């Protein structure tokens, strides 16, 4: 259709070239199976649909803009609202069509398959793994999802930072303040700026932009009198007309074999960019990874998704040291001849006196034969 | 696929598009008409040798109501046939009327003989220009006889072909055939002098909207269902085109309205069947198309599931929710179950994401496990292709 | 005076209607902020033969149709086919003929400056129409010619086109409010006509309807811009309406901005 | 059939569509050595973190808590064991901090 | 330039196979884009010297 648009001498003409339609179609739709499984992969990674309870008794943590809101008729959460309103097509209805695709493309031959899961349920799956994670940490990554107290959760964090879970259990609410206000100003960051969601504003520009073009090569001669069939076919006699009407099919084949392997590359690209969202959607909400920087930048403590349109979001929560003192610090220490060294943690002196504390934390301590493990003499 | 056995799966087939139903035809009214009706009622011409040339340009030289008249005797085109002359432009044409003896009608052939063809008005060897003649006997014979068509053709003095015989005894009504007075009139045209400025009558179709046509407005042809549309163009403008430069929009020559353009429905049609070998039912999807126009190109039907992603044939729909197990597209999936019982067949619904579950999340409750399973899974990984070298030459 | 339009000489280049679209075109258009010749229509005489280098800009502030129309040819002497655009009061009487010329074809009329009357001293504006080919006169309309000095609201803008043969005629009545040089603003000319007349045009002149001891001036002047092969982005309205344009090679900003 | 000076022609016409073919043929198989070339890296990785090593990232090597894996070499690929750790039963008891 | 170099006849030919030039204009730029976005990316990773 695109090539001989309602032209029974174009077609038979194009007979004479023969499978590369075929080639060209089995590209595609090799590209558009890519994209659904891509979908797949990245988001569906939960067995079963957790969903929290109704008292949000999160020991002081609030997650209202990242939990779904019941009231909208779509259930997405404040921020998934937010990123869908921020992202804004280009060209038409991809989508909310109630009729017809209704795009200039779909006037030669180019129609846009609507993805196989649909902004609705990829919510859903966002939805059950964020409830799973607060619910019950790690676990429901492992196997059957086990509950615990979300404070007892970000102790175990902690600990797995190398922070003693006493700092959380001491700082409880400082911390449930500092992440709530973090959230909210993430919150007023995507509302305000407009260029967070560039990577995706790309990708659906580029598309937008590859089809606009492929439209618009129907418009060249290549070399012919016109561009125009009908008017080929009323001006010139056939045995001539059959050269024009090469021209043409060879110009719009080449113009549809470049589109298509443009395509190719790009959902290479895109394949690449899923299936690193699907490692760290693994490694990132379903656990906590020591890898430095692959979950956000500082120690990490948890992430939660949410879903964007033709992407997702990690909101990567880490742990940051923030004022730091000098102190005067000993690889050892020597008491009767026998030379002390610290079983976790590093000794440090304020000035006068030596302690042993936590390498991450300054929480000082009596030098005992608790915290210290003997091995050799002074001299070594 | 080229098999006689077929997987499960859904697979693509011939695409559907709808056929045009009728074809129509817009132009503007034919108004400015070439002086024929003058030109071929003039009361009296000139003389044989001063015949009168009006130059007849910018309108439509129609032949309808001159070729289907009866009263001409003689009328033929050398160069150019009635049935071309309307779907062909000219650039000008020259009417030649003269009053010439019924003998002369011979000489008037080009490439004849007789001084008096080239003295007169000579024919060229390649005069296209179609030529009428038609007895006027009464209309140019006087009771006592017309001799200002005198016929004295021999001068002295040589006057070559397009340089610039005293027979007739009196024009009278009891003049016989081939003696009679005749009207001769040349439709005489020329070309490469301007842009084209005469053509022939266009015709004109009826209107018809919602219609999947092959339209044809002011020689802008295209196949699409029109339909009135609230765009307001401007007085002078005629087409309206889209951001990739693609007509969507059109104004009526005759009636000055605007009217949207629309691609006829297309789409590609797809086979659901599940294996071959477990049975030989099928469910067809017209992809991005609704149903109402599904039976245009199974057409009873007895099973139509309207989808967002086109509508679905042969597949019953249940509001129960299964694991996906043929994907269609828009969160629908399509299985083969039984139920009702036995009668085996393509069920369409929404794809369930998984068991529903609520973690008893307590503020002082955790679940500790007290036994264990050791599981083995297997993954697998391409890791490299057949080798292949390819001789170009 | 080599006075500079600033965004005028834009018009529709075909007969699409597109809807909040920024096209690009590659037609002949005046110049952005291009030298163009100011004259004085009155003894002093301003009524040359300007050259007409495929297309031509016209723009006036005169009431009354001071400059009635124009000549066209290539030998304007009756040896060749010309264009005679003599418009008058009532109507344009477009006609295409041989016609000769007279060296100074001008109605002069000295009215309402003594003599409080309108006197014709002459009528020499035609001389003959030797040869014809083709003629066409149109509706006897009637513009808004009366006489009202006020403040001037008749900026005649034209442009004249001739490629294939086919001769175009763009134009709009836009009114202004300052009496000074050509004023700032944006305004579209929309199609006013197209004859297939197919003759050559080399030349163009002017044509003017208006002794010489203490001889009043007329207060009159009008420009002549000349079109040239470019490149604008032209902005088109929720209706369809150029509202503004780009003039893609002016300067480096206007140039990415086409980009 | 032809005589030389009237071959060229369709000579020519030939010449381009089977380069055509192995230019789209060529290009095609570039495209997807890089795909199995990503696929064969992963593979490698996956190797030298579970087999050679036990790994704490989730989900890597296997489902739940990975303990050890074992390779099987395919057909043009490899197959991996990845034996992890399940929790099975759950008793749920009230806690304190 | 590298098609048609320097001749206008050339030039005005090659104009109406359409977007081709445009098309892989861009790609080169993209390309050149993103050698320096890698660089940035491994090297620009600590903004304090
Ligand atoms: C590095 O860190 C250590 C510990 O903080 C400092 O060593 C000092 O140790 C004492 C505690 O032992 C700190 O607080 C003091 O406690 C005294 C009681 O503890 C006994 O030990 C101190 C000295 O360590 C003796 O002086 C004292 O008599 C006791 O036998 C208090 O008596 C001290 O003074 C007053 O404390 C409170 C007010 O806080 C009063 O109610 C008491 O009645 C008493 O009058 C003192 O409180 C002391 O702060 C530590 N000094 C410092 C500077 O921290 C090291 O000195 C420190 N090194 C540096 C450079 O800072
Ligand atoms: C967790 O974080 C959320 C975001 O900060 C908190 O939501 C905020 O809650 C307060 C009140 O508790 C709201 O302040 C009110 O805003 C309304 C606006 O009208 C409607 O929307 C708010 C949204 O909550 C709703 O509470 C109202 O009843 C209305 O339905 C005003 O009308 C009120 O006068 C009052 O100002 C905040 O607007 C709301 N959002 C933000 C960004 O502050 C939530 O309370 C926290 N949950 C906890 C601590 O348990
Ligand atoms: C570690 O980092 C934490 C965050 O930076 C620190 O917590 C902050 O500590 C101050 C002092 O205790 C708190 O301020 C107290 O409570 C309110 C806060 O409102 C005032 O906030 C700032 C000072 O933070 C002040 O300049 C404004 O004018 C407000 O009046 C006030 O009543 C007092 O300022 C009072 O000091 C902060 O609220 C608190 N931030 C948070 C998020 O909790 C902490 O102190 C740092 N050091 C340690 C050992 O933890
Ligand atoms: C000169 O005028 C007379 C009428 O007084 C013409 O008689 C015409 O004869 C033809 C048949 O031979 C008919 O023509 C008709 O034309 C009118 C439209 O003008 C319409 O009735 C039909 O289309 C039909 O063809 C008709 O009998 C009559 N025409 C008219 C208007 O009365 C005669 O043909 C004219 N001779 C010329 C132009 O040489
Ligand atoms: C081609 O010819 C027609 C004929 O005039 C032009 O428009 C026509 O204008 C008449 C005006 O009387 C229309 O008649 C209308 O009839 C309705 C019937 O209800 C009446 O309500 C109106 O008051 C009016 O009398 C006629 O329908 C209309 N026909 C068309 C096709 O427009 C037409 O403009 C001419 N087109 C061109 C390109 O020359
Ligand atoms: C041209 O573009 C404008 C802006 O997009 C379109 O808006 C319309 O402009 C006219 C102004 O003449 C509005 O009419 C006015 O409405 C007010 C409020 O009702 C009324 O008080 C005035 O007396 C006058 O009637 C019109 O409402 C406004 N909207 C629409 C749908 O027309 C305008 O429509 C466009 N014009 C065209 C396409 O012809
Ligand atoms: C969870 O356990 C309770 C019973 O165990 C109690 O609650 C645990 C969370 C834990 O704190 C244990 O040490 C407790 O002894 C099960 O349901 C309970 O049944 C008892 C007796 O009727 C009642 O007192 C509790 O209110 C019930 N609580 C709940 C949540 O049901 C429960 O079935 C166990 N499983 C789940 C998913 O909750
Ligand atoms: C196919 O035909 C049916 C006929 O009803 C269309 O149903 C319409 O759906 C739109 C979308 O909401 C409504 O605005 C109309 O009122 C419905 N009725 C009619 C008669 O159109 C259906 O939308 C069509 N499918 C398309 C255009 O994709
Ligand atoms: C889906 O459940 C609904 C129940 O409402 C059924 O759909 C319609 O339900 C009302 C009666 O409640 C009636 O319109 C018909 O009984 C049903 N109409 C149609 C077209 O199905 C339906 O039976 C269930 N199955 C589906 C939608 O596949
Ligand atoms: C300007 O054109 C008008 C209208 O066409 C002229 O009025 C008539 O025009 C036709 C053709 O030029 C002539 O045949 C008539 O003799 C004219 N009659 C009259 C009374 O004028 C008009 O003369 C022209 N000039 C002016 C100043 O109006
Ligand atoms: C000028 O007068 C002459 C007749 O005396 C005619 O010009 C002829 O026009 C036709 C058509 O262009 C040509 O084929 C002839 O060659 C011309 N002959 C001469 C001597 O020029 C006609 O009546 C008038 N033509 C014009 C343009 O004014
Ligand atoms: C003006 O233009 C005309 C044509 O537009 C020239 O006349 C001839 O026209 C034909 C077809 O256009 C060409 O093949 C000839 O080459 C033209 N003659 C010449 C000498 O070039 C005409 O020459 C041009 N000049 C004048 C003064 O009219
Ligand atoms: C699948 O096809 C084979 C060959 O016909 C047959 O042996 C087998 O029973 C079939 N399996 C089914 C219908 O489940
Ligand atoms: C254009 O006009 C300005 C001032 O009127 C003058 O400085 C400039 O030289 C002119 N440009 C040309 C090419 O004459
Ligand atoms: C006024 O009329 C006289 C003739 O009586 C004439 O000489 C003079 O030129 C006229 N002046 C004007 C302005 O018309």
Redesign the pocket.
């Given at each position: 259709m695109y090539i001989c648009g309602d032209s029974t001498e174009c077609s038979n003409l194009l007979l004479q070239y023969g499978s590369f339609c075929t080639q060209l179609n089995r590209a595609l739709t090799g590209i558009a199976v890519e994209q659904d499984k891509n979908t797949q992969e990245v988001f569906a990674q939960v067995k079963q649909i957790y969903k929290t309870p109704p008292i949000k008794d999160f020991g002081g943590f609030n997650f209202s803009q990242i939990l779904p809101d019941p009231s909208k008729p779509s259930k997405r959460s404040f921020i998934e609202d937010l990123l869908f309103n921020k992202v804004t097509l280009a060209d038409a209805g991809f989508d909310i069509a109630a009729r017809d695709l209704i795009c200039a493309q779909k006037f030669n031959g180019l129609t846009v398959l609507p993805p196989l899961l649909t902004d609705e349920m990829i919510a859903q799956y966002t939805s059950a793994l964020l409830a799973g994670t607060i619910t019950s940490g790690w676990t429901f990554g492992a196997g059957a999802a086990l509950q615990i107290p979300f404070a007892m959760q970000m102790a175990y964090r902690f600990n797995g930072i190398g922070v003693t879970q006493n700092v959380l259990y001491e700082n409880q609410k400082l911390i449930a303040n500092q992440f709530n206000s973090a959230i909210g100003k993430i919150q007023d960051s995507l509302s305000s700026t407009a260029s967070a969601l560039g990577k995706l504003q790309d990708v659906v520009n580029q598309n937008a932009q590859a089809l606009n073009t492929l439209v618009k090569q129907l418009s060249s001669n290549f070399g012919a009198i016109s561009s125009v069939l009908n008017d080929i076919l009323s001006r010139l006699d056939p045995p001539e007309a059959e050269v024009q009407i090469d021209r043409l099919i060879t110009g719009r084949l080449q113009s549809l074999q470049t589109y298509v392997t443009q395509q190719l590359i790009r959902a290479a690209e895109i394949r690449a960019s899923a299936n690193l969202a699907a490692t760290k959607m693994s490694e990132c909400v379903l656990g906590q990874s020591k890898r430095v920087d692959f979950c956000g930048k500082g120690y990490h403590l948890m992430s939660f998704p949410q879903s964007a349109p033709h992407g997702v979001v990690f909101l990567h929560v880490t742990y940051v040291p923030a004022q730091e003192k000098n102190f005067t610090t000993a690889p050892a220490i020597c008491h009767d001849g026998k030379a002390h060294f610290p079983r976790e943690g590093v000794f440090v002196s304020?000035?006068?006196?030596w302690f042993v504390t936590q390498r991450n934390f300054y929480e000082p301590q009596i030098i005992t034969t608790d915290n210290t493990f003997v091995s050799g003499n002074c001299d070594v | 696929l080229k098999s006689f056995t077929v997987e499960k799966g859904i697979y693509q087939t011939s695409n559907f598009r709808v056929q045009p139903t009728e074809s129509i035809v817009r132009f503007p009214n034919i108004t400015n008409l070439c002086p024929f009706g003058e030109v071929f009622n003039a009361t009296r011409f000139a003389s044989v040798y001063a015949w009168n040339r009006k130059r007849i340009s910018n309108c439509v030289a129609d032949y309808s109501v001159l070729y289907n008249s009866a009263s001409f005797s003689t009328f033929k085109c050398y160069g150019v046939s009635p049935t071309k002359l309307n779907d062909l432009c000219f650039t000008n044409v020259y009417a030649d009327s003269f009053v010439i003896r019924g003998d002369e009608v011979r000489q008037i052939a080009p490439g004849q003989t007789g001084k008096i063809a080239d003295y007169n008005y000579k024919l060229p060897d390649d005069f296209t220009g179609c030529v009428i003649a038609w007895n006027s006997n009464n209309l140019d014979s006087k009771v006592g006889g017309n001799y200002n068509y005198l016929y004295r053709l021999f001068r002295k003095s040589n006057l070559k072909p397009f340089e610039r015989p005293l027979q007739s005894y009196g024009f009278q009504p009891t003049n016989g055939v081939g003696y009679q007075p005749y009207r001769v009139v040349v439709l005489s045209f020329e070309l490469l002098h301007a842009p084209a400025t005469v053509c022939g009558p266009k015709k004109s179709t009826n209107l018809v909207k919602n219609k999947c046509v092959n339209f044809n407005f002011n020689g802008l042809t295209g196949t699409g269902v029109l339909t009135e549309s609230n765009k307001k163009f401007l007085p002078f403008q005629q087409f309206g085109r889209d951001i990739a430069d693609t007509t969507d929009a059109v104004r009526d020559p005759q009636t000055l309205e605007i009217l949207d353009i629309t691609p006829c429905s297309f789409g590609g049609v797809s086979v659901i069947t599940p294996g071959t070998n477990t049975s030989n039912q099928v469910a067809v999807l017209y992809q991005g198309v609704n149903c109402t126009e599904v039976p245009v190109a199974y057409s009873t039907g007895s099973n139509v599931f309207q989808t967002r992603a086109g509508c679905l044939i042969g597949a019953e729909h249940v509001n129960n929710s299964y694991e996906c197990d043929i994907p269609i597209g828009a969160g629908i999936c399509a299985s083969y179950q039984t139920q009702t019982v036995a009668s085996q067949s393509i069920i369409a619904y929404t794809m369930s994401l998984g068991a529903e579950n609520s973690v008893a999340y307590s503020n002082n409750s955790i679940a500790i496990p007290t036994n264990f399973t050791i599981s083995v899974t297997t993954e697998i990984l391409p890791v490299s292709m057949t080798k292949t070298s390819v001789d170009c030459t | 005076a080599y006075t500079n339009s600033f965004t005028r000489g834009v018009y529709y280049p075909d007969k699409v209607f597109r809807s909040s679209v920024l096209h690009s075109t590659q037609d002949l258009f005046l110049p952005f902020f291009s030298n163009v010749t100011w004259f004085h229509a009155i003894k002093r005489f301003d009524n040359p033969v300007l050259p007409f280098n495929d297309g031509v800009y016209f723009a006036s502030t005169e009431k009354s149709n001071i400059i009635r129309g124009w000549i066209f040819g290539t030998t304007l002497d009756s040896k060749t086919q010309s264009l005679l655009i003599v418009n008058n009061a009532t109507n344009v009487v477009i006609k295409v003929c041989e016609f000769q010329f007279c060296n100074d074809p001008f109605l002069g009329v000295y009215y309402h400056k003594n003599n409080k009357s309108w006197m014709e001293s002459e009528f020499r504006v035609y001389s003959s129409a030797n040869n014809c080919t083709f003629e066409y006169v149109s509706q006897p309309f009637l513009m808004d010619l009366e006489g009202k000095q006020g403040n001037f609201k008749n900026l005649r803008e034209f442009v004249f086109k001739n490629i294939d043969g086919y001769f175009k005629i763009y134009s709009k009545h836009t009114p202004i409010n300052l009496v000074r040089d050509l004023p700032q603003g944006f305004s579209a000319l929309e199609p006013l006509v197209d004859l297939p007349i197919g003759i050559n045009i080399t030349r163009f002149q002017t044509l003017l309807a208006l002794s010489s001891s203490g001889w009043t001036a007329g207060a009159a002047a009008y420009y002549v811009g000349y079109l040239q092969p470019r490149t604008f982005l032209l902005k088109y309205n929720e209706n369809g309406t150029i509202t503004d344009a780009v003039d893609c090679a002016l300067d480096p900003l206007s140039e990415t901005k086409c980009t």
């Open positions: 304020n000035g006068t006196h | - | -």
